[PDB]
Design a protein around this ligand. Structure first.
Ligand SMILES: NC(=O)c1ccc[n+]([C@@H]2O[C@H](COP(=O)([O-])OP(=O)(O)OC[C@H]3O[C@@H](n4cnc5c(N)ncnc54)[C@H](OP(=O)(O)O)[C@@H]3O)[C@@H](O)[C@H]2O)c1
Ligand SMILES: NC(=O)c1ccc[n+]([C@@H]2O[C@H](COP(=O)([O-])OP(=O)(O)OC[C@H]3O[C@@H](n4cnc5c(N)ncnc54)[C@H](OP(=O)(O)O)[C@@H]3O)[C@@H](O)[C@H]2O)c1
Ligand SMILES: NC(=O)c1ccc[n+]([C@@H]2O[C@H](COP(=O)([O-])OP(=O)(O)OC[C@H]3O[C@@H](n4cnc5c(N)ncnc54)[C@H](OP(=O)(O)O)[C@@H]3O)[C@@H](O)[C@H]2O)c1
Ligand SMILES: NC(=O)c1ccc[n+]([C@@H]2O[C@H](COP(=O)([O-])OP(=O)(O)OC[C@H]3O[C@@H](n4cnc5c(N)ncnc54)[C@H](OP(=O)(O)O)[C@@H]3O)[C@@H](O)[C@H]2O)c1
Lengths: 276, 276, 276, 276
């Protein structure tokens, strides 16, 4: 121990200070994902598909994930439009054995994983908990939106550690920071808050070999009660819901060398909703 | 709804504004729990027993909970010493059925429940998650420290709604706000962050009939290695661990009429640890 | 240095760990202010007067502060109703020389100061900054609501350090955490956020001799546009404004031995407003 | 207002919902600043010069600011190297009159301003405030690091409102979120916390015509003692200080169309320092 400065955060960092990464002098090259492999869960859905296509535009090979809506045409669209390698995988992410099998298969098909986006999730749709007289809905949310996120993280983290590099982005939500009204959804709020702090916890644990960040989107447009959204608009400083395309910059920032000193951060993309 | 301002948070509040409570003119009377019934989970342990005895000193009947360390003599101690009603209940709080049965039995035994402290919990002891090859410890933490807290909350909330009054205090942790070092414990951190935000979520949902708050203790003297504790002291602005007696003021403040406009709040009692 | 554990926060703490305070075993005695001297600025106003009277009920001598509304009858009311020593002082807290003169006079009249509440402040009333084409209103807010708070803190802190004990409570606001709507008040929001973080900063700096905490009230009732408050009520989970009497428990908690491990904390008393 | 949903945040948004922007289908095009004019205060210094050159690489004209270190050759360097328009301006930003004159001159010289970075600032260097017998250093920090930021914001905001578009990025600091140790600097911490919340406040007020965000850097290599730096490294999860080139991605993300739904956000770029 003598003759070394040892970290208080994680002694696996080795003698301090650690070495800064080599970076391009041109800011635009920092955002490139050329030569990197990305794996995006929930990429048959709106947000995940937008991020997957953005990563392919940035040069990444993209592993697509789906559960009930096969996304093979999406992977083949990435294939043919951007000349990257892409393939879709079927997985129920609430099953930890299935998550491990899928990620191990992706590592074999692509060689490695450089960027992972833990994005799949489901909403709570049943209103006030106090009237829901069993726990299956609570457990469904926790099992996919928290446990499933962790199954993905734990599994891909072992790949990142083997290679000494990697970027994990978790899709949280403004629901992890505030309480949505008037549609009440305590179970989802709690799971996303756990996601946001799991991000910070894993950033510390994985610092020798990877960065971990999350994005917390606000309301993103996609046959929901018009007066309820009217109240959302009224409480949103920008005055509107967001588009999936307004999220891809944040996910590319965190995935790429643009953010090599950014870890444990939560990037709010919510139209200002968390400010009032 | 014409002629009535109705809430954007919870229309069960009825026509706004709601009526302010009647409060004693004397500040010390606000902290009294005379004529109220308290239920404190994990009150065979250090923090929970300190809070239970404090509530008894404030005049409350106290339902004591244990799992593996029977606390009947503690109940007994409270009845004898302070003249309040008290009885100890055995319950594995990770079992939702047992939680329901125990709280219903307490309602029968004491008549009602006015104050509930969801305090039982277990730590993560196994170091960095990346070396842990199964999910049993993760699941153990989530099932008691998050799901079990929610089983307690959902069950007692129906009592609060029926009676139109109640105060729920959840024991979170500074681990819900920061990432402990050097002992890495992502699963516990995630569960406690979920607890802190479940507090806020339920505060909104239960507003017509109850208040919901949490206390986030720092390191409390309640058997670990000497160098690790030393780094805790170095990072704590007050320079020491806390005593359980330094928590009871916060729990009495939130449980009593001293805090009738306080809901959804997280009260840090951590020696300043969350500040650096 | 050898043979001592030295703090990373503040080496003036001395060899770690520091000694825990001696505390009563009865929770209610922890809240007493008997034998202690309190100084409450802005105590001719609503919140400050409620806190002053609560501190006197708890047994404290109370120094009253006023600027444009003489409060001598208030001090004499404390005198005669509770048998404590009390006296009112005139001071424009935006004047740093006047603050130092007033606190030094109070130390002479009362012997010492044990509890200080930096509570005086003024609101921003002029709507959107972009239309206010000079800076006198901005500077008026910063000078009293931030600089004046610091003048008080810096001055009483020297007394706390001399005596080795003390508790500073700063009146912040939920405006230091969120952005009020629809009445826009950026200058006030910025000053109160600075207040909340000054609390945390001074908690670290003063840890060898004092604790520093703040209270962040929500809307407190006291001939303001009825539809504007209607929107406040709609966005407040409890559905109403608060009473000054609902704040005094928080100020007594932080002032007294009930909170001896609580420092750098922000206690939200806002009806849940910061949760949505 | 019958027939129109109007905002609870800012009725200048007009009838809700507001219209989404037109965005490129290609993620890399979102980060371009071609055809835009940027103004970066403190761009003779380390961070500001890095951001200015990054903006020029993205295609923006860049107005450079200096105070005591003339940066005309830097402007010159940008024009020469990247073919954009650039010129350096001398201004003491603590003087509100000079700030107004400088920004009006830039509007004349460049035609408009599309992006503003309020980055100039000075540190607190004098250790614990309790030993500092006057307020000159406190006032110096507040006047530049808070008031001067606001003078810049108020002035350029009127340009943004006139043109109906703009992006303001404020350089805050992790010191607005946590308390630096062991070098104690309450005045700087308070000013930066005010900056972070001024960001959110102005995001709400300017929503009809501009976005407002801030970046909170950690320790950036930009001459201090070796033991103190060593403790910084020990408390930083990544194990090192950051480079200014590791910040430019965040500033380009916020300045460009990559972030059109991002407003009121604080982007931490601190090596994880705010996590433990
Ligand atoms: N306003 C918003 O939409 C919003 C805001 C904040 C955060 N988020 C979060 O953004 C993420 C993406 O959601 P979205 O908005 O794009 O909604 P979405 O279109 O419904 O996407 C949901 C995705 O999750 C997958 N999924 C659902 N259950 C799964 C399971 N058991 N196992 C594996 N995958 C499963 C779905 O796959 P299949 O369709 O193939 O079954 C789908 O790809 C979620 O984490 C969401 O909570 C959304
Ligand atoms: N530094 C700290 O101590 C600290 C800091 C922050 C937060 N907390 C939290 O404080 C709470 C625990 O208090 P503590 O520190 O005093 O620890 P403790 O002395 O070990 O007590 C833990 C309590 O939880 C009970 N418990 C454990 N498993 C249970 C289960 N399945 N079902 C029902 N009850 C169970 C235990 O009962 P039995 O003993 O009878 O089995 C015991 O009463 C937890 O929420 C903890 O995370 C502690
Ligand atoms: N909804 C709320 O009311 C609310 C919410 C959150 C936080 N707060 C904060 O609570 C604190 C007390 O405010 P309040 O609600 O009780 O309003 P208030 O009744 O108007 O009290 C204002 C106090 O500040 C004093 N004051 C004003 N200017 C002063 C100056 N230059 N120098 C010294 N003292 C001065 C006033 O003294 P004189 O009257 O004698 O001139 C008065 O005692 C303030 O910090 C406020 O920002 C209020
Ligand atoms: N570790 C860090 O470096 C760190 C971390 C977080 C935040 N920040 C913030 O980054 C910004 C400064 O960048 P830096 O770190 O690169 O420090 P820096 O190299 O010393 O540059 C500071 C800039 O501020 C200018 N400046 C100083 N006083 C001024 C005044 N009265 N009027 C106008 N401009 C003035 C300076 O101009 P002249 O040199 O020409 O006088 C210089 O350009 C500040 O907001 C700082 O608080 C820095």
């Amino acid at each position: 121990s003598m003759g070394e400065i040892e970290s208080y955060c994680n002694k696996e960092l080795g003698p301090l200070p650690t070495k800064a990464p080599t970076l391009s002098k041109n800011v635009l090259d920092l955002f490139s994902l050329k030569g990197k492999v990305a794996s995006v869960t929930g990429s048959s859905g709106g947000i995940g598909w937008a991020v997957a296509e953005a990563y392919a535009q940035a040069g990444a090979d993209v592993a697509i994930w789906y559960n009930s809506h096969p996304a093979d045409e999406k992977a083949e669209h990435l294939q043919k439009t951007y000349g990257v390698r892409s393939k879709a995988y079927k997985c129920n992410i609430s099953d930890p054995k299935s998550v491990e099998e899928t990620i191990s298969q992706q590592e074999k098909d692509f060689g490695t994983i450089d960027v992972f986006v833990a994005n799949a999730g489901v909403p709570w749709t049943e209103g006030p908990e106090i009237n829901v007289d069993n726990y299956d809905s609570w457990n469904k949310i926790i099992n996919l939106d928290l446990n499933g996120v962790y199954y993905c993280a734990h599994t891909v983290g072992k790949i990142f550690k083997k290679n000494g590099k990697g970027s994990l982005v978790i899709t949280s939500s403004m629901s992890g920071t505030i309480v949505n009204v008037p549609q009440l959804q305590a179970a989802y709020n709690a799971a996303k808050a756990a996601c946001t702090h799991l991000t910070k916890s894993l950033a510390v644990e994985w610092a020798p070999f990877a960065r971990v960040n999350c994005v917390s989107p606000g309301y993103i447009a996609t046959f929901v009660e018009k007066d309820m959204k009217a109240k959302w608009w009224q409480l949103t400083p920008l005055g509107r819901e967001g588009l999936a395309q307004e999220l891809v910059g944040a996910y590319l920032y965190l995935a790429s060398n643009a953010s090599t000193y950014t870890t444990g951060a939560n990037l709010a993309v919510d139209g200002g909703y968390t400010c009032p």
